[PDB]
Symmetry: D2
Subunit: 473 residues, 4 copies
């Protein structure tokens, strides 16, 4: 049971319009919207969306496995060994938000301060004392972006596992010699950095020149969650405000995906005429190039929606019915919708490119979709006994000799393994991950899906407790 | 009663060595060490210090007023009008951590997200609706470091007030025309940006080429807090670990100041022989050039302590008794003391250049000295009734029509004015400042003075509660 | 009769081995090697080559016209108007080395100092006084590389004409409004800068992703000069020194082209066994990425010559028979051949990327191939009467009222038109072009083809007269 | 007899106004203006000047020796050894335009292509074969500006000799160990790069914070050439055009120097009323910051000529009588004088900062003053027999075994030594220097002094022969 099984299960249910039914459906943790900073929904005047993994939630593990298979086949195509074709995607290994150390070829799970929580070389999990040889302070410099790459997105899940697969394969294949910073093959030396770049280039290629999009759109039921409540919720948003789309994807792909998402024999509610997906948006913008979008952006272009090509030249005209934009900047949206930043609730899945950047650069209000939360919540509530025991051990030790520390490490591991080999997205034991810290800092609201907004009235006041400093308590 | 009066009051008392006396003296909020993240003191192997406003705490408002007077006289010297000499430093106006907007000439107090809490043009405090003309989203882009300058340090307090003085003077002087981005004087236009640069250059000049240091060292009793407990605490640190000094100041000034700080007719305790200040340090490093120090740093030099000049060449030798270093990098300290980052507790007063940077770049443990906390604590506990009323108003409104909002704004202002015209260092009403957020994020421990460590045993476990995400609660 | 007709005519003749026959064949200006700086051939130990337009001389105007047609069809493919398909390449318009001014959409012919010699907007040649509106000092800043693009190569000849075609088309097409910096089409504004970028991108695309290479290799007789003297001369070079190839092209294309160039029923001389083209080289390097090659270069790779793919990893081994390199740097060649810069004569056609950069960065000796010289020489000797008259007019005026200036401008134009609409590669009248100045400064030797070296003994001392300053004469 | 003795000798003579007297005085090579590119003086509408070493020609070797002594005393002041005080400036060693290699501590004389002509380590002149260890291709990369510093100016002559003095001193002083890249002194290593930086910093300090200016202005007869013909020539220029001053020096120094230069008991001619120096200029601009001046420049300021301080603010007004500008850009001059680049003859002594940059960035006409030419001409004409013999040897060898090469090297050295230990500014034997090449390329006119313009009518056509390519001859 993957997180997308949970979402597609909730998606299959009819949308009860009764006001008591929505407020009661809101009880389950799975249907809740979580609040890091208070937000008065009545002040929101524009609802903004990205598409991928927000409106178009790709089914797991089928879509990761497709991306993994095409990336492997691209690497074999450029000259990697045929043994790569015997890899098979394993959804139990990767957790999102890991850091690949391109110097030593390690996947690292770190906290907000660069402290090491988990270190794996290939499929070998390196224990505390052994990591100190490569990480003397059990710490990485996050600003060393040439060395460390943060695997922020769900699109990065196939390459997260692929990187570990490759390190494992070259380590144990007799043809190659293992060195500290790569692998030697006779007169050829492949550094982990160059291998990582090949992987990155191949993932990009699969998405932009390969067949991933084509294979997705030829079997949309297999790869994309479809929910009749999505048109309903978007129609409610457009009744109280303006609605816009700003996606990094191109128009031809967006049109195919969005058409599928809205292909029901009715409009927002059963019995209503079907409307085209574009009619749900006051402003549609593709090729957004986020996060650069939230700074200078790019030249504003207009899409010829008949051919799917860009019209030649910079678009200098006004917002018109049926126009589709390409490129531009976040200021394009604000000017054309007559919005200020805090009037906008932007719903995205990219913690860095959508949420952090719109918050810091423009002061937009933010809603982070976290697809895996649909299943991490289930693990969290089911295995809560282990966390409560861990909390007790931390408290008992905080007042105590060392037989407790071995029990702390033991329960930490058992808790983490319920999530997978790389543990929870949000923590390792009692230590929070970098990802959790960035969710708390930059996502005003968050949920497994933005559809959970259906269960709250549009006057709702999302409330978070005020923060106090230690000396103020 | 300034914050330095509080510190000098506590400094004048004898250090009772009784173990029950120290743990009981620790009760008062003023003698406490506050904890943002848990820290086991037994793991600390090196105690590091800066000098200015940490070991050498400059008396307020005398030192700010001296800096203000010399900066004004430098500006008049380069051609600013004689009316500047009628300014007089006013300690009730500036709060530390304000942002000067060089485009519009405003002092801004902002939260961690760039939201405006206070805006003053000269001495005119701009009310909410009027700020929207210049700040349409009541928000500044903090990454626009060419436009916004954060006045982080206590050394910036004179220029904080001076900037407001200058804007006020040119606005109301009939010879000048007020424009949006500066002042016009016939065929001369002085932008707020160029005026700000003149101020910055003059403050730098006063510290590095003018007479500020000379005037300080010729009346040390007037300008520098002296505490007999400082040699005592440093001697205890050197009994359990190593102690180092890394100051941005030069050796000749450091030697004069430190000699004064240790000039008592005894050593650590009354009855003991006096020891030179240098004997309290395993490593002394001047001209540190923090924060660059925590990256590549500069070439490591050796001070000729007889002449006070640098020896010619890069120092390639080892740590030796009596050597004094200049420049280098944080790695110099780690290598020479055989320390890893988390072995080091670095005690500093510069939230950015000492604390944020050593934490993020090197994973050092951090102790932030906040001199004004000695008096902000007194205001906080005395006027606690206003904050509790403010908390009630926020709760009552969070469940309610708009007669409460005017009461919220009214109590916010009355609370803030107890701290001064620019309010608390840490908040405006219920909203925390950028400075408060950076203290919580990067200072593991903090206190009005590091001397408060005297009241804790060196095995102490400083404890902070574990953080949970909203969905984990 | 194009310049490549001249070369292919000389190519069709048998190579007479008689030593008196070669030294006599050297009399014609067309078979000479011209000398800017003295060069003793006996000191040359390595002969280096690029491939395109040096070993593989593409026939004119067929190859330019092919490149023009595919670039036009790529622009139409991305959305440019169908009228582009009615353009047809005209070899009489473009001269190499022109500067496209992306601000005003002009093709400029300039001297070494940025002075304007010719200015054309579309097909309209702007006369002296009219250029002063856009060029007040009849001068461009050559360091403004964001505004001015120098069309250095023969590959740039199709886009030189295409840029003029496009400016002409949009100017005179009623659907578009002509503005100073581009063309307006309703709500779309296309700047000359964005149009220029589209052209550049399309030319790149045609060469790297389109069908230009495929169409060339499917009709090599139509597109590539073939000379039996090329294997002969290369074999003589390998008898006295080492021979290397460093091409920006990839191995699969290089192999196809070079195989064709060496496909004769014999080896160097008639009657000898045929040898593969690779056997003529001590070192073969593709994907050179010149001019970056002459600085840090790129990682050194090894080509799998069976598949045409790069082997995975950096090549760390030695120079071996049959190895083919990819990337690397000029230091790769020097180290592997045991050469110093002045031991190397590098034969190239790119005045900037081959000749200027190897000379300035590495002190290599240089031989510039200038394909058009084969025909510019014929025009120069035939129409010499006009130049001599021009020289007389300059002398007579230099001692004289203004009826001479109109005659000077008149003869200048008549002389220039013999070369084409944009005049000689090397001058406009008595003023030398930027290109001529860079040939003189950075090409030690030059010729229409490097095959002219066949007519000189390998002990030859190429001689240039010593330069004196004015005060030394 | 120094070059400034020649200039001061010519300066002491009365200015005969007879038109035949001026055209006859023009015969001597010493009074001629030399021409690299033709220039019609009637087209010049503005005459521009720098001050230092153009209007204010500092006497040699007294001024170099003063600069040397103060720089040495500054280095001793910061901690260099006392033995430096026994150095004494030697005008026979330095030639202008040498390159200090900061890696190996060598002074290099190079040609325009980076080829080594002379190499000296300290006072040891390294012979051809021995230089190949450090310079394998007898070549330096001029674009490696972090390694190589070109000593372009007459102000650099003291540090040219000082650098050789220091290398010589540390090499032969027993306390220091000689390494390839510097000197070791126990645990201190001083690289040639850091030593070079100390020298550079000290020269800057002497000019901007030390006593060099003060000592110059207290003995102007000792240090500055004074010529009654200078006011005369400037008055003739102002009769036919506009005259401007753009100096890097500050106003207080400029005023002192210019007052001295114009302090005669008469105006332009004997018998005329004296006029203040400022009245000879249509535009006076100080603090020019050339060469940045010829790009974006700096903010335009106005000097308060009463106090010598800058007025506060950017000057936005027009050109007015008596105004003195500070900063700005070359566009300031063009706009205020209504000039285009080719209307301007700019007379400067800095081959890079005045001449190269105004020519390339702005297309100004250029006149380079070369003070040493006053004496290099005398050596050139006196020792012409050696050069003619050298030319014969080159011709005889160019048609010849190796007994001639030793004679070529022998005569080259004897010729060079007549100029000094580092040879002619313009050549070593038959090889031209980088400096000579840049004079020819960027100086339209040149002379030992701009005063030589007095001997030419303002309608004069300076003529240079047209350049032909080898294939055009
Ligand atoms: N999740 C992320 N993915 C990719 N890049 C990131 C992410 N978070 C931060 N960055 C960028 O990586 C660089 C290094 O980050 P840095 O060490 O400055 O931490 P930071 O982003 O300031 O986080 P914090 O303020 O919590 O320390 C920064 O320029 C930042 O913008
Ligand atoms: N207190 C400070 N004083 C001066 N500069 C600062 C301070 N805090 C951050 N900076 C620097 O200012 C620049 C702009 O900061 P930015 O907008 O990235 O916020 P940040 O430092 O990442 O804070 P946060 O992560 O809390 O948003 C950054 O490069 C940062 O290093
Ligand atoms: N033929 C060329 N094609 C492309 N770029 C060039 C060419 N010649 C020079 N450049 C580059 O263009 C930039 C601007 O050149 P710049 O104005 O400095 O002239 P330059 O190359 O120094 O020529 P010169 O020394 O003759 O003035 C330089 O960085 C230079 O390397
Ligand atoms: N006389 C000089 N003094 C200082 N810098 C110079 C001088 N001449 C050139 N430079 C600068 O030094 C850098 C390196 O020069 P580079 O190797 O490009 O030669 P260049 O100036 O283009 O000369 P050329 O065109 O004759 O080769 C350039 O950016 C150039 O502007
Ligand atoms: Mg998305
Ligand atoms: Mg400090
Ligand atoms: Mg080529
Ligand atoms: Mg000068």
């Amino acid at each position: 049971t993957s997180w997308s099984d949970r979402l597609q299960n909730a998606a299959d249910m009819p949308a009860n319009m009764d006001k008591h039914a929505l407020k009661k459906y809101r009880r389950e943790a799975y249907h809740r919207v979580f609040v890091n900073r208070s937000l008065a929904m009545e002040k929101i005047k524009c609802f903004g969306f990205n598409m991928d993994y927000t409106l178009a939630v790709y089914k797991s593990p089928e879509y990761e496995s497709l991306g993994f298979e095409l990336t492997v086949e691209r690497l074999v195509s450029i000259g990697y060994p045929q043994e790569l074709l015997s890899f098979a995607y394993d959804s139990t290994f990767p957790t999102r938000g890991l850091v690949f150390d391109t110097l030593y070829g390690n996947l690292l799970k770190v906290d907000a301060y660069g402290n090491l929580l988990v270190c794996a070389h290939g499929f070998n999990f390196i224990r505390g004392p052994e990591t100190r040889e490569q990480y003397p302070n059990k710490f990485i410099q996050r600003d060393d972006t040439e060395r460390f790459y943060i695997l922020n997105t769900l699109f990065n899940l196939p390459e997260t596992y692929l990187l570990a697969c490759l390190v494992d394969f070259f380590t144990n294949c007799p043809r190659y010699t293992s060195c500290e910073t790569g692998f030697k093959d006779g007169d050829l030396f492949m550094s982990y950095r160059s291998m990582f770049q090949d992987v990155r280039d191949a993932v990009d290629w699969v998405h932009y020149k390969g067949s991933l999009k084509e294979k997705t759109v030829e079997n949309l039921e297999k790869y994309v969650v479809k929910d009749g409540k999505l048109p309903l919720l978007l129609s409610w948003m457009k009744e109280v405000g303006k609605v816009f789309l700003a996606t990094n994807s191109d128009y031809k792909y967006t049109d195919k995906i969005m058409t599928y998402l809205f292909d029901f024999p009715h409009g927002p509610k059963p019995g209503s005429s079907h409307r085209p997906w574009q009619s749900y948006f006051d402003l549609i913008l593709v090729d957004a190039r986020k996060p650069l979008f939230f700074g200078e952006g790019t030249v504003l272009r207009q899409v010829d929606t008949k051919t799917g090509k860009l019209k030649i030249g910079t678009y200098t005209g006004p917002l018109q019915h049926g126009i589709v934009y390409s490129g531009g900047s976040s200021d394009t949206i604000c000017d054309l919708l007559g919005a200020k930043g805090k009037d906008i609730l932007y719903i995205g899945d990219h913690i860095f490119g959508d949420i952090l950047k719109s918050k810091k650069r423009q002061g937009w209000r933010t809603f982070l979709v976290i697809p895996e939360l649909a299943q991490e919540l289930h693990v969290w509530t089911d295995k809560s006994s282990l966390f409560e025991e861990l909390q007790s051990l931390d408290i008992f030790l905080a007042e105590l000799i060392s037989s407790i520390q071995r029990r702390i490490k033991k329960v930490t591991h058992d808790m983490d393994m319920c999530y997978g080999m790389m543990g929870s997205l949000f923590r390792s034991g009692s230590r929070q991950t970098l990802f959790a810290s960035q969710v708390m800092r930059y996502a005003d609201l968050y949920a497994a899906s933005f559809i959970n907004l259906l269960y709250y009235p549009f006057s709702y006041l999302f409330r978070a407790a005020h923060v106090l400093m230690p000396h103020e308590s």
